[PDB]
């Protein structure tokens, strides 16, 4: 009877401000689940991966590099601490800024090869929105990992700081650094 | 008093089981069921080759040991009367009183 809630949350009125990423984030009421550790069997159909929630996708991309290859309970705990830190940082809801980070955490176009079997000019082409979600989650978790590598800060604290510095246009996070690294090369090879 | 029928293969197992139940239905004995045992398997892996040339290509040899147990409370004369069975040679019979 109650609303579908993560912890003591609400999971409501999280509005995606734009188009081209709608119906791919599972923030809505029809795909609201209590934990990211769900039955993830989304690798059979080509287009059933988009129905996965982005918090579960963030946990799945967070668990990498052999020594932590697995441990969904540990990475769901890390994302729980990260959402708690983002909430305690002056409100500004962690699910809302997570959606904002998926929107504004990297590529809007990429450059790749064309055919013709001649000179590779690396023409700047369009990029799939699913591929934008994939590369955004990958850049966020990679930046959080190498920011929390060899320091006193934790994985959850650097992931929270990465999501905040990616939702806010401060140009101080590694996702925005590789956004610069991709879009300056894309404008140069445009 | 129990009787164990241990067979080499499943077809002779089911044939001797059907024959024994068919011979045990008509008598005045409370015949217990043919209690199924878990099938034993001896898996053996072999190099396939005397000298080591090529990929690590391995055999997989198996057996399927099948076993059934029944319980028949009876006097020893009736047990020795039931003991005479025209049987497939792939079936071994053990008795315990």
């Amino acid at each position: 009877p109650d609303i579908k809630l993560f912890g003591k949350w609400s999971t409501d009125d999280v509005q995606i401000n734009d188009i081209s990423l709608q119906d791919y984030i599972a923030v809505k009421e029809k795909y609201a689940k209590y934990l990211p550790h769900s039955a993830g069997r989304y690798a059979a159909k080509r287009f059933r991966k988009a129905q996965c929630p982005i918090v579960e996708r963030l946990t799945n991309s967070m668990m990498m590099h052999g020594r932590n290859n697995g441990k969904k309970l540990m990475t769901v705990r890390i994302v729980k601490h990260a959402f708690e830190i983002i909430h305690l940082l002056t409100g500004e809801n962690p699910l809302q800024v997570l959606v904002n980070a998926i929107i504004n955490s990297g590529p809007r176009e990429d450059s790749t090869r064309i055919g013709r079997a001649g000179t590779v000019r690396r023409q700047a082409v369009d990029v799939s929105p699913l591929r934008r979600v994939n590369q955004a989650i990958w850049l966020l978790c990679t930046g959080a990992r190498e920011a929390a590598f060899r320091n006193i800060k934790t994985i959850a604290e650097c992931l929270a700081d990465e999501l905040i510095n990616a939702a806010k246009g401060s140009s101080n996070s590694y996702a925005i650094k590789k956004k610069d690294e991709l879009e300056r090369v894309a404008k140069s090879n445009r | 008093i129990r009787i164990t029928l241990t067979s080499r293969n499943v077809k002779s197992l089911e044939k001797v089981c059907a024959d024994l139940i068919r011979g045990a239905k008509e008598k005045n004995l409370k015949v217990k069921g043919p209690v199924r045992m878990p099938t034993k398997t001896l898996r053996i892996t072999t190099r396939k080759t005397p000298c080591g040339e090529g990929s690590k290509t391995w055999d997989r040899f198996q057996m399927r040991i099948h076993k059934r147990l029944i319980d028949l409370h009876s006097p020893s004369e009736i047990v020795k009367q039931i003991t005479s069975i025209s049987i497939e040679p792939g079936v071994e019979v053990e008795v315990t009183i």
């Binding site: 601490h81 708690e84 305690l88 320091n151 800060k153 934790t154 | -």
Partner: protein
């Protein structure tokens, strides 16, 4: 014998930086002065920003917890989560 490696990446963060074992007089006084100014009392921020080790940071945070100035939200394995009211 000889020392050879295939990569060259030197110049780390700060040159074997020193860090205080026990709290000083003026350092702990500054901690008590500006500890309400921080909103998210986390031991990593208290250690890296205020020249504290992790053990002395956890000791000071447990001391202020026993004094009752900063409310604990949820303590866990290595993410100590403290918040000050107002």
């Amino acid at each position: 014998g000889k020392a050879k490696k295939k990569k060259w990446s030197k110049g780390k963060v700060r040159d074997k930086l020193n860090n205080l074992v026990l709290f000083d007089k003026a350092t702990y006084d500054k901690l008590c002065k500006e500890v309400p100014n921080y909103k998210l009392i986390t031991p990593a921020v208290v250690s890296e920003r205020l020249k504290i080790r992790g053990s002395l940071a956890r000791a000071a945070l447990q001391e202020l917890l026993s004094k009752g100035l900063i409310k604990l939200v949820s303590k866990h394995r290595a993410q100590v989560i403290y918040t000050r009211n107002t």
